[PDB]
Amino acid sequence: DVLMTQTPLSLPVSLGDQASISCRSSQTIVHSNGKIYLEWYLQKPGQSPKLLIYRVSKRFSGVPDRFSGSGSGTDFTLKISRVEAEDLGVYYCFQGSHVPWTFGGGTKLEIKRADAAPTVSIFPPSSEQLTSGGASVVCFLNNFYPKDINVKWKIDGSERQNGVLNSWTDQDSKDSTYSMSSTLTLTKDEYERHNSYTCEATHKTSTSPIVKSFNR
Amino acid sequence: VKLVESGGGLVAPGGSLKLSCAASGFTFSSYPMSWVRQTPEKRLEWVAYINNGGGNPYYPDTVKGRFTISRDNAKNTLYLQMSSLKSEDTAIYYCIRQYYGFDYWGQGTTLTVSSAKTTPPSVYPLAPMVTLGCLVKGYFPEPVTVTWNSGSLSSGVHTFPAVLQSDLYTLSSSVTVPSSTWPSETVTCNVAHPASSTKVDKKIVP
């Protein structure tokens, strides 16, 4: 089969700056008819992939002027001249010259923006869950940048690590931020043996952790 | 141009499952169609082709002999019959109108090949501009869909990816609204689990 290898794996780029994504095939991809069928797709977060370019350099209808394709032999390149926030997502190259048709592995486009601190929010267990005999405490860390962040749970002042489960969103196409949820799961019995519950987020925007608490 | 996929769900290994795709907005019989899947690793794999007349059904060897593409140009429907299902087949399957390339994609329907049992989710409210949330705990397989006030609340929302723990998925959904709006007006989390055919509406109350 034709192997399609994309470079880089991830590409941070500021708004207005340029982004370039390389595709390399394991062979020449000229069809018997003499044409090269290299296509570029973009998958935005939460959506199906979208066709951007076909036939190496041809824009599909609706694709703005700033998306450019080029290449021949085994080396092909997608260029984005003035990155907008709506362009973030994963870019896939693809050859349709030889069967089986094959995709590249993807290159993630990340928007560089100014650092932003999270908006922290803690939520106690619901009475509906307590009836089940379980108790999940949740902490939303919303709309921050960059992606990496630390969250520390504390029950009655003492750090708590087991039972924590963290999950990050993809980058938001509107404000270029990230959000993440931290969920500490306990038993109902264990939950009711303690009173003070605390999640505190540490982000590079401050040496002072952002702390949110509740009682009972 | 709209393409809607159906038929996804949980299947035991070695089992069979057929997908459908509802085509609209164009002359279905004029265009060739393809299926493409996306694995949980987010790798894209073309899995089937068929020309506008229902001929030249073509597949990669990874699925050849097990999958069968077909179409009913009378009913504007594209089908994908699967059999002898492996764990490697677990993916989101996209229905595609092909011409220049894969020009139009459906939103996908998810296949999961697993011996585990279908488990629906338990939905819990998360109450304290004010931020509210939904906790969607302990379901299988993926996926679920969460909305706020049946789609009215579109901004201020982000839903966090599900994580697999102990063979069950859990996720949460956050929504942020004006302190004016809540509790003054009803804020409801609507959760749907297609693999279990479940729908739940949890109102967020103080």
Partner: peptide, 6 residues
């Protein structure tokens, strides 16, 4: 210049 069939 549509993609050719396999």
């Amino acid at each position: 210049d549509t993609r050719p069939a396999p």
